[PDB]
Amino acid sequence: TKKVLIVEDNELNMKLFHDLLEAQGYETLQTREGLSALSIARENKPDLILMDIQLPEISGLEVTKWLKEDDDLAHIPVVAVTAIRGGCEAYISKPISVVHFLETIKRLLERQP
């Protein structure tokens, strides 16, 4: 099953992103901090990283820079959520459009090997 790591400090956004992804049958990993995202990514190898750029403690774009500098994490597609192209494969605007949100993520997640 595909695993998506959601990096989102806002409880409401995290729940919405989680519910939408779970309804699609995906497993998720969750964290409110950019640094933790790096740690979790190395420990659980998510298939895609959904990251809010406007985190309170750090820019999501700087976190993406670290991701791309790591040989084990650089291949993981990163979708930025902003209220980028930093290394992000795609961007999703907030307030989000549910279909656009899911289409963007599924396109990057569900590719033939």
Structural domains of the chain in order of their starting residue, each with its CATH number: 1-113 (3.40.50.2300)
The rounded Cα 1 to chain-centroid distance in angstroms is 16
The dihedral of CA 36, 85, 73, 77: what is its sign?
A: positive
15, 96 contact by CB (below 8 A): no
Burial class (CB in 10 A: 0-12, 13-18, 19+), 51: buried
Q: Is 47 annotated as a binding residue?
A: no
Enter the DSSP assignment of 102: H
Q: Is 22 annotated as a binding residue?
A: yes
Q: Is 103 annotated as a binding residue?
A: no
Q: What is the CA radius of gyration of the chain?
A: 12
Burial class (CB in 10 A: 0-12, 13-18, 19+), 91: middle
Q: What tokens appear for 53 in the block?
A: 């750029």
Residues 6+ apart with CB under 8 A from 24: 102, 106
Rounded distance between C-alpha atoms, residue 69 and residue 25, angstroms: 30
CA 86, 91, 93: angle at the middle one, nearest 5? 130
- Give the end-to-end CA distance of the chain in Å, rounded to a whole number: 14
Across 52-65, b (16+ Cβ under 10 Å) vs e yields bbbbeeeebbebbe
Rounded distance between C-alpha atoms, residue 37 and residue 49, angstroms: 9
Q: Is 9 annotated as a binding residue?
A: yes
Give resolution in angstroms: 1.9
